[PDB]
Every structure is written in structure tokens, then in C-alpha cells.
Amino acid sequence: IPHGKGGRSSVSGIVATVFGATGFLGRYVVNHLGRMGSQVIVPHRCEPYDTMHLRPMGDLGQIIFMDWNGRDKDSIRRAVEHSSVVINLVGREWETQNFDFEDVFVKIPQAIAQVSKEAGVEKFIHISHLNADIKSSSKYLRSKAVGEKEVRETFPEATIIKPAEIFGREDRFLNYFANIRWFGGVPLISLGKKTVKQPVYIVDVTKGIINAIKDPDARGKTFAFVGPSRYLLFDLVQYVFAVAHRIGRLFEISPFEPWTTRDKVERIHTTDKILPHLPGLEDLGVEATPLELKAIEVLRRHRTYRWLSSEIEDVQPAK
Amino acid sequence: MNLMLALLTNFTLATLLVIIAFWLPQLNVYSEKTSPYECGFDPMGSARLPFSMKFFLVAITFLLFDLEIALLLPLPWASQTANLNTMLTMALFLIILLAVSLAYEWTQKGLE
Ligand SMILES: NC(=O)c1ccc[n+]([C@@H]2O[C@H](COP(=O)([O-])OP(=O)(O)OC[C@H]3O[C@@H](n4cnc5c(N)ncnc54)[C@H](OP(=O)(O)O)[C@@H]3O)[C@@H](O)[C@H]2O)c1
Numbered sequence: 001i002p003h004g005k006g007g008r009s010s011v012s013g014i015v016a017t018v019f020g021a022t023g024f025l026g027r028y029v030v031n032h033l034g035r036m037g038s039q040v041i042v043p044h045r046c047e048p049y050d051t052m053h054l055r056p057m058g059d060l061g062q063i064i065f066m067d068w069n070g071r072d073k074d075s076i077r078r079a080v081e082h083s084s085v086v087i088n089l090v091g092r093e094w095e096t097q098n099f100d101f102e103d104v105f106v107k108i109p110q111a112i113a114q115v116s117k118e119a120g121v122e123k124f125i126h127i128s129h130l131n132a133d134i135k136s137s138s139k140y141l142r143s144k145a146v147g148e149k150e151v152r153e154t155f156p157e158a159t160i161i162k163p164a165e166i167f168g169r170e171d172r173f174l175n176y177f178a179n180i181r182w183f184g185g186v187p188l189i190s191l192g193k194k195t196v197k198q199p200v201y202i203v204d205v206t207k208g209i210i211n212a213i214k215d216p217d218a219r220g221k222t223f224a225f226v227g228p229s230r231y232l233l234f235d236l237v238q239y240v241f242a243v244a245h246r247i248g249r250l251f252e253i254s255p256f257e258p259w260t261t262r263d264k265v266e267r268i269h270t271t272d273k274i275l276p277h278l279p280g281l282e283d284l285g286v287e288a289t290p291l292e293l294k295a296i297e298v299l300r301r302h303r304t305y306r307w308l309s310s311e312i313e314d315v316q317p318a319k
Numbered sequence: 320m321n322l323m324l325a326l327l328t329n330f331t332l333a334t335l336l337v338i339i340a341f342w343l344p345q346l347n348v349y350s351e352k353t354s355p356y357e358c359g360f361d362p363m364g365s366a367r368l369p370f371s372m373k374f375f376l377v378a379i380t381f382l383l384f385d386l387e388i389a390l391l392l393p394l395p396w397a398s399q400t401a402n403l404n405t406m407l408t409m410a411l412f413l414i415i416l417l418a419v420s421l422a423y424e425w426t427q428k429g430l431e
Pocket residue numbers: 020021022023024025026027045046047069070089090091092093104127128129163164165166248
């Protein structure tokens with residue numbers, strides 16, 4: 001039950017449990033739950049120090065930390081016992097040299113679709129992507145579609161979310177570009193055919209959740225997040241170099257956290273603008289943010305003062 | 320032929336240790352907030368570098384006292400010599416010729 005103003009130090013009824021919550025997507029969620037105030041039980045894998053910038057979000061006794069491996073059952077059956085909602089965003093990029101990567105999107109969202117489901121939770125939420133299609137792409141992009149399909153068997157009403165591609169503040173998607181101060185700028189693959197996707201702004205995706213977390217009546221009704229205005233061009237890569245003007249890893253360096261001479265060069269250019277009958281963002285209101293307002297901020301190289309911004313795009317066509 | 324391999328050892332050991340500190344163990348692609356910070360423990364300095372007169376005369380004055388020590392430099396080689404009344408009375412000239420250049424400037428230095 002709620003009480004008083006929801007500024008800080010209130011009760012607000014909900015008791016979430018947000019798995020992951022260290023990466024760019026999982027962290028920025030917990031910031032908006034350390035405002036309205038709630039028992040946001042965040043468990044973390046193996047990181048004592050790398051989670052320290054998360055503590056001045058929970059007021060005093062709001063958040064709480066636990067350690068958990070993920071494959072073992074009861075390590076994820078001990079935190080899910082006292083909860084109201086539980087959302088999932090676990091996962092990564094490329095296959096690691098210890099794990100198997102196949103069932104990690106199958107058994108592990110099912111390992112927390114175990115007695116977690118039975119114990120009395122509600123509003124269990126998973127994530128998707130706008131390009132995860134069971135047609136022959138990719139090793140990561142499909143086998144996420146296994147997680148769309150093989151985990152849908154349990155919890156027949158979830159509101160699994162299907163956000164668009166994200167541009168943000170500390171992300172990897174747009175930041176994979178303009179970090180290519182290198183012996184050449186090679187696009188994918190010297191072509192501007194299907195560029196670009198829908199770069200939704202990360203504040204909207206973390207505002208969609210917290211409007212769905214007490215919506216009500218949003219269970220089973222999966223959602224797909226609208227992007228900015230409107231499609232975009234290959235001019236994006238030219239626009240990135242327009243204004244730019246050309247955790248827990250190791251002690252010295254981690255010798256393998258690469259740029260992946262594999263599927264990753266084409267894990268983003270397979271676009272597949274999916275079904276526009278999905279409800280999917282504006283009805284999960286209210287949020288609609290462009291790119292050309294929030295583009296100055298995260299792009300940051302050695303000029304640092306002089307921008308003189310005028311670069312834009314028409315729509316582009318098929319708008 | 321080691322003079323010249325007496326120093327190219329010393330500089331390739333020098334440039335070795337800097338790139339195994341500036342490069343290698345470094346690469347800060349994580350959070351690495353290089354935002355507007357790093358401004359040398361301050362903020363934005365909208366002023367440029369202003370001229371300071373009392374810190375220009377210190378440059379020129381040294382340069383004109385630096386020349387005639389190189390004239391004064393071959394005094395130990397001017398010992399094992401011929402006619403030495405010339406050698407003594409000319410060696411005393413340059414020092415006084417350096418000394419007067421003090422005393423004229425010494426009546427106006429400024430807060431140096
Ligand atoms: N919606 C989108 O547009 C989009 C884009 C890219 C990726 N994704 C996927 O959607 C989620 C977004 O995550 P993100 O953007 O914050 O990047 P992220 O680096 O994948 O962060 C997610 C967290 O999951 C952790 N993790 C990886 N393997 C794990 C395992 N076996 N067990 C427990 N934790 C594990 C990661 O490292 P730790 O174990 O150290 O915590 C990380 O902290 C991820 O699942 C991601 O693969 C979505």
C-alpha cells in the first residue's frame with residue numbers, strides 16, 4: 001500500500017526483484033525505483049566493487065544485495081520468495097570461454113521461471129528485441145528467439161517487452177561507432193541500404209517499465225517500442241562523425257573483451273521493422289523522444305567546446 | 320663504435336617503459352567518463368595567456384650574459400701559451416665588460 005509523496009523515503013507498495021542490473025540497461029532502471037522508493041532486491045553475480053555506484057539510490061534499507069550463480073536452483077529461489085513483481089534482463093553479447101550460450105537464453109530464464117512461478121509472484125517480465133527472428137539469423141539474434149518461444153511455455157501471461165534499438169549515455173550500440181579511430185572507416189558493408197533502425201532513447205524504455213509495473217491489466221499483452229522521428233539513413237554514420245569532428249574485468253587488462261570478428265558486424269544490420277499492430281509504446285504512455293535533441297550529449301571527443309550544430313535528416317523516405 | 324649504442328639502448332629502454340604504462344595496461348573503454356572534467360583541477364578558463372613584461376626581460380638578459388662566457392670558456396686553454404701580458408690583460412677585459420652591463424641595468428631591474 002502507498003503513503004505520502006513519492007519523492008523519496010515513501011513506501012509505494014511494490015517490492016521488485018531486478019536481476020542483472022549492472023549493465024547499461026539494468027542499472028538505469030533501478031535509478032527510477034530508488035526515487036519512488038521500494039524494496040528493490042537486486043542480486044548480483046560476482047561483483048563486490050563494481051556495484052558500489054548503485055548504493056546512493058536506495059534510501060536506507062530500500063535495496064539489498066545477494067550473490068547467486070544462476071544455474072543453481074535455490075540461489076535464485078531464495079530471493080524470489082518475498083516479492084510482488086520480478087523483471088528479467090539477464091544475458092550478454094558473445095559466447096564466453098566458460099559458458100555454452102545456447103540454453104543461457106533457454107534454461108536460465110526458465111531457471112527463474114521455476115518455483116519462482118509457483119511461490120506466488122505476479123507480473124513476471126522478460127525482454128525481447130525488434131530483430132530476434134527465427135529465420136536464419138543470427139547465432140545471438142536467433143537463440144534469443146528460442147527465449148521468445150521456449151520460455152513462453154511457462155508463464156502464459158507475462159508482458160514480455162520488445163524494445164527497439166537503444167541509444168543512451170553509457171551504451172555500446174552507438175558507441176561501437178565513433179570508437180573507430182582506426183586505419184579506416186569501413187561501413188557495413190560499404191552500403192546504405194537498410195540503415196537505419198529505430199534508436200529509442202533509454203529514458204523512454206526505463207519509463208515504459210515503471211508505467212507498466214503498476215499499469216494494471218498488462219499481462220500477456222506484449223509491447224514493442226516506437227523509435228524516434230522517423231526511420232533514419234546511412235547519414236547516421238556521417239551524422240555521428242558530424243558533431244564528433246572525427247566492469248569487473250581484470251587488474252591490468254582483460255585480454256578478451258573484443259569487437260568480435262564474427263556475427264557482430266551483422267548482428268545490427270538485419271533490421272526487420274516488425275509488426276506495427278503491436279500496441280506498443282505510446283499506449284504504454286507517455287513517451288516520444290527524438291534523436292536530434294539528445295545527440296549532442298553522449299558523443300564527446302577532443303573538441304569539447306565548439307559544435308556549431310546544423311546537421312539533420314529529412315525523414316527519411318518510407319516514413 | 321659504441322656511443323651510438325651507448326645511448327640508443329638508453330632511449331629504447333626509456334620508450335619501452337612508457338608504452339607499457341600509457342598503452343597496454345590502460346585502454347579505458349568502460350565507463351571512463353571523459354566528460355568536461357579533467358580540466359586541470361578547475362573549470363573553464365575563458366581568458367587566454369596574458370603578456371607579463373617582468374617575465375620577458377628575464378629571458379633576454381640571460382641570453383646576453385650567456386654569450387660571453389663562451390668567449391670566457393677557453394681560459395684554461397689560454398694558459399700554456401706565448402706572450403702572457405696580453406693574455407692576462409685581455410682576460411680581465413671581458414669580465415669587466417660583463418660587469419658594466421650589470422651596473423647599468425642594475426639601476427632598473429623591476430620585480431623580476
Ligand atoms: N533491448 C536491447 O536493445 C538489447 C541490446 C543489447 C543486448 N540486450 C540484451 O538485454 C539485456 C540488456 O543488458 P545490458 O544492455 O545492460 O548489457 P549487459 O552487459 O549484457 O548487462 C546485463 C548483465 O547480465 C550479466 N550477465 C552475463 N551473463 C550472466 C550470467 N550467466 N549470469 C548472470 N549474469 C550475467 C552481465 O554481467 P555480470 O554477470 O557481471 O552481471 C551484465 O551485468 C541483456 O540480456 C542483453 O544481452 C538487449
